[PDB]
Amino acid sequence: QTREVLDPIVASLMEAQQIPGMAIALVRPEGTTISHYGAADRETGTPVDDDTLFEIGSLSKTLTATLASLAEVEGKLDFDAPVSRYLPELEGSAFDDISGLNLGTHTGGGLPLFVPDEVTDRASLMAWYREWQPTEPIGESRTYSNLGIGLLGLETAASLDGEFVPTMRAKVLAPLGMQDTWYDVPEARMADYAMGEDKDGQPTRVSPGVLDDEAYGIKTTAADLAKLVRANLHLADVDAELQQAIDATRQGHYRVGDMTQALIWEQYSLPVAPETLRAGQGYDMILEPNAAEALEPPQSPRDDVWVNKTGSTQGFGGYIVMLPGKHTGLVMLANKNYPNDARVEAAYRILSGLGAIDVP
Ligand SMILES: [Ca+2]
Ligand SMILES: [Ca+2]
Ligand SMILES: [Ca+2]
Ligand SMILES: [Ca+2]
Ligand SMILES: [Cs+]
Structure with a gap:
């Protein structure tokens, strides 16, 4: 049924990109369909099944965002408040002027992508933050950032008086x-x-x-x-x-060209073209600073949008798409890091094939 639309697209995808195995969840109002394909490990040939664990990479950021948001709902974290309010060890640094909201939207003053080599542990990390100088106007420019969401995780953990992992496990997972x-x-x-x-x-x-x-x-x-x-x-x-x-x-x-930056989640108004989605997952969006315009009539969650997040590691590639208006969502996990363009195309074909969007 759903599997009739889904299976040939996945087979072609896995053949075209030489992906050993995938796990796919289709969420709809009527229930959720889980499908597994191929091998969890190419060398051993062990099949992907209900128990197979995949590295989801930056997909992790959505959980981080969710915990942060919960701390906010519980009144323990204020999103627009300076980060140094919850982490006094950063008091006097740039994080007197950067909020948790900035960190969750990648608008923290050009905070860089990767954790630098000199940073090897928590203490060298906090020293690096104390000394770092913004390179972009805070709240007006988007640079996708591990250091930023990382810090939002540390800011959140402090605001909840708990360690990040157990606190995530108890309050969200x-x-x-x-x-x-x-x-x-x-x-x-x-x-x-x-x-x-x-x-x-x-x-x-x-x-x-x-x-x-x-x-x-x-x-x-x-x-x-x-x-x-x-x-x-x-x-x-x-x-x-x-x-x-x-x-x-x-x-x-934040409005970022055609993209709306939510809390980690990135979204587009419908109808959306696949080329627009592809541009969101490309060099220009991910690896350059993009001008960002704050929405402070903070936009209420929308029901006419394509919501998504990619996530990868060296050996893994994941994609989550949500269509709130159709109460429909898609999770695609692979044990290969295959191009984001292909994830986008496969998602779009799946959802169009399911009738959840229209191509023209
Ligand atoms: Ca506030
Ligand atoms: Ca490194
Ligand atoms: Ca760790
Ligand atoms: Ca194509
Ligand atoms: Cs667990």
Whole structure:
């Protein structure tokens, strides 16, 4: 049925991009369909199944955003407040002028993409933040950033008086029922941990690193992510504060050309062209500063949009698309880092094929 539309697109996708295995969740009002394809590990041939864990990379950022938003709903975190209010060890730095909202929208003054090599632990990280000088106007320019969302994770953890991972597990993952979601894959589940393949056909698995948890560290199943997506689409029953936290992550905060930056989530008004989506996932959007105009009539969550987030590691590639107006969402996880253009095309074809959008 749904599988009739889905399966040939995935097969062609996996053949065209030589992806060993995929896990796919389609969320709709009527229920969720989970599909697994191919091998969790090319060398061993172990099949992808209900238990297979995939590195989701920057998809992790949506959880980080969600926890941040929940701290805000509980009144423990103020989004427009200076970051140094919750992290006094940054008092007197640029983070007297940068808010948690800036960090969640990548408008923190040009805070760079990658954690620098000199930063090896928490203490060298906080020293790096104290000394860093903005290179872009705060709140007026977007630079996609691991350091920024990372800091939002640390700001959030302080505001909740807890450690990031257990606090995420207790306040977001457990209540969403996301029990196959891990930051550090336990020894007992290593057999379910899919092996990544890089662009050269080589086995690869993500290494620990500074701010890994906050920015890119999650290993999970497609079904678990579908639960986050379910909740975003108002198709789950969750704690009222959690739902409100989740809803607030889709508030539009900045216009960035054709893209609206919400809280980590990025969105486009419908109808959207695939080329517009592709431009969102390209060099010009991801790897350059883009002018960003604040929406302070803070836009209420919209029901006429394409909401998405890509996430990758060296050996993994993931994509989440939500269409709130159609109560429809799509999660695609692969143990290959294949081009974002191809993720976009496959998503669009799936959703168009399902009748959830129209091509012209
Ligand atoms: Ca405020
Ligand atoms: Ca490095
Ligand atoms: Ca860590
Ligand atoms: Ca094509
Ligand atoms: Cs768990």
